[PDB]
Amino acid sequence: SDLTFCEIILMEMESHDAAWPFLEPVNPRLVSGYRRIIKNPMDFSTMRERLSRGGYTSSEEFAADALLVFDNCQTFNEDDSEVGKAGHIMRRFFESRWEEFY
Ligand SMILES: CCc1nc(CN2CCN(C(=O)c3[nH]c(C)c(C(C)=O)c3CC)CC2)no1
C-alpha cells in the first residue's frame, strides 16, 4: 500500500518535465570528477529496477533513494545549471507528493 504509492510517485517523477537528467545513471567515465565526488549514485531507472523486484521493504527505503538523486544533484551541480535547476524542481515535486500521501 505504501509501496503502491511509491509506484505512482515514481511514474509521475519519470513523467515530469524536469525528469530529463534523472532517467539513466550518470556515466562516471563521461563526467570529469563525478566518481570522486558522488559515492552513492542514484537515478530513477535504478529505483525502478529495485522497485519492480520488490527490493524496497518500506516506503522509507524508497524515499532514501529519491533524496539521493536530488542530494547528489545539488552537491555536484550549480543551482544555475540546467541540471541543478532540474534537481531543485524535482525535489519540491517529490516533497509535495510525498507529503500528500505520508
Ligand atoms: C554527459 C555525459 C553523460 N551522459 C550520461 C547519460 N545520461 C546521464 C544523465 N544525463 C544528464 O544530463 C545528467 N544528469 C545528472 C544528475 C548529471 C550530473 C553530472 O549530475 C548529468 C550530467 C551528465 C543524461 C545522460 N552520462 O554521462
Side-chain angles (χ1 to χ4, degrees), residues 46-65:
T46 300
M47 296 171 64
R48 170 65 66 175
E49 194 284 323
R50 178 170 174 191
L51 186 58
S52 77
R53 58 169 164 77
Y56 290 116
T57 54
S58 72
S59 54
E60 282 70 32
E61 291 180 345
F62 177 86
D65 274 358

Side-chain angles (χ1 to χ4, degrees), residues 64-79:
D65 274 358
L67 298 185
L68 256 184
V69 180
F70 316 130
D71 281 347
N72 291 343
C73 178
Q74 180 167 187
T75 288
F76 187 82
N77 301 283
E78 311 296 332
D79 298 353

Side-chain angles (χ1 to χ4, degrees), residues 7 25-26 34 39 42 44-45 47-48 61 64 87 93-94:
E7 205 307 306
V26 177
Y34 195 74
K39 289 345 280 145
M42 190 48 58
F44 296 160
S45 73
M47 296 171 64
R48 170 65 66 175
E61 291 180 345
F93 180 75
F94 169 83

